[PDB]
Design a protein around this nucleic acid. Sequence first.
RNA 1: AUAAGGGAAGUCGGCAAAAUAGAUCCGUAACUUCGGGAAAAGGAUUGGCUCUAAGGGUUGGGCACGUUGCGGCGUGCGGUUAACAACCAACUUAGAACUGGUACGGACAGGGGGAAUCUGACUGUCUAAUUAAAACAUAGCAUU
RNA 2: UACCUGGUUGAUUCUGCCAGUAGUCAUAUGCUUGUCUCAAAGAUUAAGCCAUGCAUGUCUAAGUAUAAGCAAUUAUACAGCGAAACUGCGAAUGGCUCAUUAAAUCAGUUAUCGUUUAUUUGAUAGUUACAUGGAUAACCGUGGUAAUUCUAGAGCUAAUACAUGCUGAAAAUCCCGACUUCGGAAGGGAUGUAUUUAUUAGAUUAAAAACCAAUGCCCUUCGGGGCUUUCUGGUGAUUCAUAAUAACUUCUCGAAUCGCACGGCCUUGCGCCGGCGAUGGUUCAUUCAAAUUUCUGCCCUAUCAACUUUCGACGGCUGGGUAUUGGCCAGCCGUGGUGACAACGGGUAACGGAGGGUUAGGGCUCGACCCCGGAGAAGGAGCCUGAGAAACGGCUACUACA
RNA 3: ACUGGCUGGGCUGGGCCUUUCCUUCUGGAGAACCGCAUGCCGGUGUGUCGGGGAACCAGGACUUUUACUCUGAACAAAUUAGAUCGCUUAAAGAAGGCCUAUGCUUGAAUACAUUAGCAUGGAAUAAUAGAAUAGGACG
Lengths: 150, 201, 261
Amino acid sequence: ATELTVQSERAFLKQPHIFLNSKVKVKSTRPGKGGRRWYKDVGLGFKTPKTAIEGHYIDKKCPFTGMVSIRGRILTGRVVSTKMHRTIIIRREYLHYIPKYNRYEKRHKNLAAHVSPAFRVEEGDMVVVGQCRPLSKTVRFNVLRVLPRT
Amino acid sequence: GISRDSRHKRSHTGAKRAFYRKKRAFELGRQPANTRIGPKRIHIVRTRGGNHKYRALRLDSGNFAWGSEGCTRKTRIIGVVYHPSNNELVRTNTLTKSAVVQIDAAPFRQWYEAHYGQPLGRRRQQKQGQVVEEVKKSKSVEKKQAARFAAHGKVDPALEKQFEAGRLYAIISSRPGQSGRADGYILEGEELAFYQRKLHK
Amino acid sequence: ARGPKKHQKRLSAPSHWLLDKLSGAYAPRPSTGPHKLRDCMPLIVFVRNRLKYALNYRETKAIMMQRLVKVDGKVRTDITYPAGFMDVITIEKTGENFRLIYDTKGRFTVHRITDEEAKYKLGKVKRVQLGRGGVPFLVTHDARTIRYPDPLIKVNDTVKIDLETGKITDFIKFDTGALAMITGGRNMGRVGVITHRERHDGGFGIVHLKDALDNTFATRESNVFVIGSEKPWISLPKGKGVKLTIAEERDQRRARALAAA
RNA sequence: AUAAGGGAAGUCGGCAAAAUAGAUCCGUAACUUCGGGAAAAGGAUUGGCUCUAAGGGUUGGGCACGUUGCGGCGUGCGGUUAACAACCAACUUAGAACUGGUACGGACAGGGGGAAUCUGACUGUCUAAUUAAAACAUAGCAUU
RNA sequence: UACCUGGUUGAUUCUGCCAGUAGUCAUAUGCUUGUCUCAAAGAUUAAGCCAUGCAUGUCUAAGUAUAAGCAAUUAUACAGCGAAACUGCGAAUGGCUCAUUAAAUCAGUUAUCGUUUAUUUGAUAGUUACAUGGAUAACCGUGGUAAUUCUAGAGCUAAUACAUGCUGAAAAUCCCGACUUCGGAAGGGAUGUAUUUAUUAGAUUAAAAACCAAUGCCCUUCGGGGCUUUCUGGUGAUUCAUAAUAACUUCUCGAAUCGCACGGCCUUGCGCCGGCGAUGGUUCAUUCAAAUUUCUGCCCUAUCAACUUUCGACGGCUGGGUAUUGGCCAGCCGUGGUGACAACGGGUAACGGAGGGUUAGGGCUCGACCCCGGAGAAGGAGCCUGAGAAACGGCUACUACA
RNA sequence: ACUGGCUGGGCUGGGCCUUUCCUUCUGGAGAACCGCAUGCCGGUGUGUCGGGGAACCAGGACUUUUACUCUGAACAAAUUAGAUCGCUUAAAGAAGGCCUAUGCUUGAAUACAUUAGCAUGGAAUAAUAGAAUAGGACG
């Protein structure tokens, strides 16, 4: 994503419990221990993108470098709207079966998910999302992977 | 009383919902308590499950911890100087979480004098009104103190200037309405430059 | 609904209790305890409905007040006490001991045991972790917690309990080739040997078993209960859980009847 | 100029007088030549004091040579300050706290409204010194 | 049991409807009525109004007995049974009804790494003392009002009611250091648990060296050859479990309680030790749960085609409040969200489901009602106690009846 | 009713060669085919012997994506279909039976729901993706 500045707000943005003002300098491989950027692994065969570990953005809702755990259903869909800030709308299509006439009909539903600044998402792309705790009035899913374009 | 349910809202399609049931014992809310700087005054409240919470109405002192050094001393709060959310919080001198305040620096300076055998922030030498020396009752202490001073290092100039006046900047990191205590830490480093630039401009 | 429930309606009681639909409107409603309400064995049902020692409700509690019957070596005095799998019931005055174990039809049955076998138990382990002060501990399937266990013991295994001092004496790992008994599902009461196990990340792993007659069946991991490697430690009931089909059952039924008479 | 209680019971007839009135924010019917009716009807706010926020102008920008009394030009380039620093200047708009004998367009200035009938389409004109109207004119139409 | 017949014409073959035929755990009514097994029943119109009676209380050997209580007569503190009254628990379960309600309730299926939990079950907490201090009920006696399960002032006495309160241990860790020969040391303080903030540990899972700075050491010929190395749990996944340091708090808990047995030691002192139960108590686990939450699924109507943001309608951030998440609420900043795959609105003689009736197969129709979930107690709002209530056989106020 | 045979004719399935056959590494235990010497009536336990891992188990990596069908798991009692037992028969009920017993013994099965969700085998039918400005594959 494209973000002009990291600190552009009333308060100071920082990861909680990451101490940044130490007199002695010690170099360590651990992410959060030494005083450098913290990140985790979601699991379920999902790989951390390179942009997350080396980026400077601060986000408390991103599945990477954030305080949200992913558990529950995993769904797929196509994005139809990307005109909010860090939020997208996906469309899911399926077929309902009418027993009397022995044939199906088309139906669809709309879903809202949170998109992290690590990914770059455009209209008409397929994405994979995972369930999380309620983050808003109508946001209960988080973007995990962006499939390659044709 | 106050309720925090979502029944009274409007659905995401714009439709208006209908009445479902009367208000429940849960989903309630309570009147906010506005903490102020003054003599101590605290009320008890009986919450869910038989537990208790502590409403703080007026406070004047609390714990503040120095990050780099690692000491925690109790001191008093002089006044509120900045609040990222609302200006009326600053003017009223009412304190909540993430409020920048000013605290007395006397307890922290004294510990530095004992731990390190060097003076910290003394420009009264021009007046020399309160200059005084007490004979140090040992000689092994210089070996111990000079080792500490040469190892840990020196304070940065930004924090040293505040010690001359005797006032230090801090941020409240507790929730006085919930726990009834005002606690925080001394802010320093890059975070100091952000607030100092914002405070006077 | 403004608090917790305290009544149980007949026709809603667990099916495996074998309760007649007439003669009353309510059911014993087992009290809270170590075992789940859905799958438990209330003491009144065992004493009155299976052993038929007590005629009715009034005389069932007369026996209990005399502290004649005890479970796991400690006397219990409430008629609706939830008993469960592997529990040992001892009546000293009459002089026999019982162990609660499923048959091949998915219900509890009476099973005599010898006095020598009535002094130990075994249970599945639920969790292992560090407690207060750094002391390790584990909890079994019947809410027994024991401190300072063997570090080799992990979750899903089974441990032999002294039942007199409450100390672990030997254990069995959970792996292929073990002998297990099912505790939940439609395959309730079957006995088989674990063939291989397949795991799915995100929960609900499954295990494949094999019967003595080369039959095959599968179940979730939460319903498999290892009871031995070979020659199971406890004494299995008659039939050993082989699950004969309906065709063989009527053939055996008439064969047994004519052979006896 | 003012009047207790009543409020057109006075009179050919509400003649005279009273009531409404500035600005900001809500709300607004039948009918219609779709332009209107409309300021329809009908509601709320308004002082003093101490504060907060928003709406502008000017001058400065890195090296490498040559001219000149710390510099003005000749240029040869490169870069787009993740927009900084100093100075200057009037008013218009929005929001919060406190305060009073609940008062505040404090004098002046300043629309009463609604349901219908008869008649001329409208703006315009005439009996100076008793009649300003339904009378005259008008665009449109037709005839010689 | 996969079934048909009468009726348009002077007569005929068709489309086509009217009538006939059978069932109903589907209601009413008329005539008639001997026996055996089973027994539904003020739902439809009025969730309209109610005289009178009942429907919720509770004691063991084990909380408090000076009943001018009874009974015995082993108890000169009490000792058997035991009214009354204080204290503890329950009264939030049952039972009734279908008024509201059209993605709302509900069904099958997921999550709580987003929370509370009386009780039950299993573990678990070393910091005057041979026993601390004031009240009150029952009771005696003196009164008021036409009136109620209304209550006044005076005199006694209890606690498992209310309120105080006692390092009985060491070691180890971290600070200050009286005092030198400069290389360690006299002795001084803190250190259970709960509460609040800041900081640290919580390892990896293929291998061989060579340098700088400089120190536990073994062997030793004093030239030195050198240096093997002790722990670390769990999940698909975390700042998880747990531990250490500096401080904090109108601030907790760590037993001044009760019953049976009658025992063992010698320094024989009204000395010391000792069993089994009852009732409590901090944290973790379990049980009965509760609150939110993922996916898909409801009748007719277009003479309902555009809807939402006055005064939150969609999203970002800092806080407030709640048992916890959340536009649930307060400030500041963006301009979004649903729709012909039927949004929004209007109708329902509409509580949802398991299921009932009728049958070749495919279907049509009903479900107030014994089982599960939700809501209500004449209409609206507010609240106390408590683990749990927005309770009505609990309280406060208005409107309508009385 | 039992048993064997047919170069018996069929049905279902599993192995090889035809240009195709079936991903891969680590570890576990261990066979088959092999010889080594010790012993019986041309085969064999020999042994912490070794050339050696069919198959199996556990762990890691790679594999176009949907619909469809098969088999599993999980899911309520009552109801519907349905097995057993002469309540004097029956609608029901879940009981009962045996010589005589101061005793023994049994039953309270099974199928269906069906939309959505979770796994497994099959690969026809109907869609979908890939190397063309090579931005392609391999060592």
